């Protein structure tokens, strides 16, 4: 029998997406505040900024983004090819497995156990666990594909598929490390080589985890919510293969004008610029899909999210290539500009798209026809947008100020500004950003409240067969 989608796992990951969203973004607000008002460090090792930071980072990407991807792919794949998830128990494992990972991150990082590698900060025993959970996830996803009904595999799953495999490779390679003790390992690599392995991993983390994986989301939810066909199949092909291949090369745009050899740096810029095309093929395909149905934007705030989501995606896949030009990175690198780019993509693209996707799916998965309050989806939307824009704006101001101030020479060749002067210049920015994030965070609470109210709804949920 069994021909009714396995909605159990999707339900768990959905809820947990909202929970980690809150925890992750809360932490974000908190460390933002620390940068403004250092007393919030509290002279405690576990609550100081240096240790909390990678918690925000891992919480927000792997916990929030992660769960969003699980909830999204498990929902999307099942329907997009019309069978129950392959091995529903192995998928259940990947839930608790993943939760255990996040919980270990929460305990381990403020405790000081970090590899220092950005977005790979968790120590070796946790990297073993991750690999196990990931392999299990790969089997659940690709298995579901392997036992589909239709001859064709939806382009949404090309992206998911890619993301899954390539994150697996990435994760294993960049975490090769000799264990010294329980929670301490040394990287296999050093110096320039380590830097390259790191940013090959680092960029392709957002390249595939935060771009590819989420374009999979976009490809299901934009058309499904809009109820239109996907403008240009062909674009999907080019835009997919070109992205999947060019993105890997973008590693070196992190290490511009560093000890990384010149040749690699260039290879990074050149391919980062090439990448602009395939990236936009994503947003073109998503937005032109809405053509004719633009009137739905005043009507449906869930669609608003998805669309505005692409606006920021587009912007940050433009900004990225620009900042990957050596001369631009020459100003941008080390400054708050990078953080702005990050959050534009992070709040504006990743968060917005997954918000929208959840708002769509959460009711469905809880055997319920829609969210509790559509008005709160709209008020969420505005908080989330105002929030994102403030954050971006304050980081551009800060980043330009920093870049400029650091390199500012006088008429007699001497450096114009002390580093502390640049620090001071940044304070207003640090505060606006803290408010910007706070506002964004408030919207997440509005989501939590909304989701919860809708979850009370029915209790023998499960309404989804053919």
């Amino acid at each position: 029998t069994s021909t009714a989608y396995s909605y159990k796992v999707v339900r768990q990951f959905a809820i947990m997406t909202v929970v980690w969203g809150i925890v992750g973004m809360g932490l974000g607000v908190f460390i933002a505040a620390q940068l403004a008002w250092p007393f919030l460090n509290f002279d405690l090792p576990w609550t100081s900024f240096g240790r909390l930071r990678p918690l925000h980072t891992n919480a927000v990407i792997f916990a929030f983004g992660g769960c969003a991807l699980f909830a999204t792919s498990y929902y999307s794949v099942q329907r997009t090819c019309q069978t129950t998830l392959f091995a529903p128990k192995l998928a259940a494992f990947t839930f608790w497995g993943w939760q255990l990972v996040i919980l270990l991150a929460a305990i381990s990082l403020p405790l000081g156990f970090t590899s220092s590698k950005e977005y790979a900060e968790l120590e070796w025993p946790i990297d073993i666990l991750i690999t196990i959970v990931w392999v299990a996830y790969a089997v659940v996803f690709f298995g579901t594909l392997a036992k589909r009904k239709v001859k064709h595999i939806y382009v949404g799953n090309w992206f998911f598929g890619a993301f899954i495999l390539t994150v697996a490779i990435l994760h294993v390679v960049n975490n090769l490390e000799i264990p010294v003790t329980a929670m301490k390992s040394y990287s296999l690599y050093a110096g320039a080589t380590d830097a390259m392995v790191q940013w090959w991993y680092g960029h392709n983390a957002v390249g595939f985890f935060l771009t590819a994986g989420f374009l999979g989301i976009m490809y299901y939810f934009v058309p499904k919510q809009a109820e239109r066909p996907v403008y240009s199949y062909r674009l999907s092909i080019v835009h997919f293969w070109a992205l999947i291949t060019v993105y890997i090369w973008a590693g070196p745009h992190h290490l511009h004008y560093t000890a990384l050899p010149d040749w690699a740096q260039s290879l990074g810029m050149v391919m980062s610029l090439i990448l602009l095309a395939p990236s936009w093929g994503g947003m073109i395909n998503g937005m032109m899909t809405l053509s004719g149905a633009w009137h739905k934007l005043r009507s449906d705030p869930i669609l608003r999210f998805l669309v505005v989501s692409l606006a920021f995606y587009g912007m940050s896949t433009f900004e990225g290539p620009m900042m990957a030009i050596k001369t631009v990175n020459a100003l941008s690198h080390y400054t708050d500009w990078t953080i702005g780019h990050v959050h534009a993509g992070a709040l504006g693209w990743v968060a917005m798209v997954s918000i929208g996707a959840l708002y769509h799916l959460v009711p469905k998965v809880f055997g319920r026809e829609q969210m509790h309050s559509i008005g709160l989806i709209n008020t969420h939307f505005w908080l989330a947008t105002i929030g994102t824009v403030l954050y971006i704006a304050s980081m551009w101001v800060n980043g330009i100020a920093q870049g400029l101030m650091w390199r500012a020479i006088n008429d007699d060749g001497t450096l114009t500004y002390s580093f502390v002067e640049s620090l001071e210049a940044s304070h207003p920015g640090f505060v606006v950003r803290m408010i910007g994030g706070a506002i964004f965070f408030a919207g997440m609470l509005v989501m939590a409240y909304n989701t919860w109210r809708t979850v009370q709804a029915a209790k023998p949920a499960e309404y989804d067969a053919a």
């Binding site: 950005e118 050093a190 090369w249 690699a264 391919m271 080390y334």
Partner: protein
């Protein structure tokens, strides 16, 4: 068409996605300039190594780059632009990606130990407008040197030419020293290797 073929798609993906990794990372394993240590440079001493791991645990990297870019103004502000050879024994590398505080690639001997101690204990206390967290626990904590031996052995295995002399009694180079002692020792070696070769 490869979109009805589950394994064919899988294979071409794992293929497509590999090219950049193979072309950027692999050749660096074999490039000389990024594996040669700078002239006279030694591995980190037991204490320095122990402090580097303290720097790592505290998240210092999150606010501090160790990578001077070859521009005049960076040069003027911090010193000689960082060189591939300087970080050749850095498992893992600690070039930054952010400068909330200044670059530390050459904090060198630019400040006294005494300053470093005061400043880590409470940066606002010496640099009133600092946004750096206070790190007073570094003073209350004592290294026992239990694992220093293992760490060096591990790192030698990874290429770092620690002597048998180094590993033997890396413990008693470290035992009884405070975390703050170790942090300062580490900071005082940063970038010194280049400017005294």
């Amino acid at each position: 068409k490869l979109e009805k073929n589950v394994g064919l798609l899988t294979l071409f993906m794992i293929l497509a996605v590999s090219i950049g990794g193979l072309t950027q990372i692999v050749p660096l394993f074999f490039q000389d300039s990024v594996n040669e240590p700078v002239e006279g440079m030694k591995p980190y001493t037991a204490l320095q190594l122990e402090g580097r791991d303290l720097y790592i645990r505290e998240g210092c990297v999150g606010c501090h780059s160790q990578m001077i870019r070859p521009f005049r103004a960076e040069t003027e502000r911090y010193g000689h632009y960082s060189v591939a050879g300087e970080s050749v024994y850095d498992h893992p590398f600690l070039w930054g990606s952010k400068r909330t505080g200044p670059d530390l690639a050459r904090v060198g001997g630019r400040y006294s130990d005494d300053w470093h101690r005061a400043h880590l204990y409470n940066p606002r206390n010496v640099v009133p407008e600092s946004k750096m967290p206070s790190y007073p626990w570094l003073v209350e904590n004592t290294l026992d040197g239990k694992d220093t031996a293992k760490k060096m052995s591990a790192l030698r295995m990874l290429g770092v030419p620690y002597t048998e002399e180094d590993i033997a009694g890396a413990r008693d180079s470290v035992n009884g020293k405070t975390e703050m002692d170790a942090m300062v020792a580490y900071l005082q070696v940063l970038g010194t290797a280049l400017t005294n070769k």
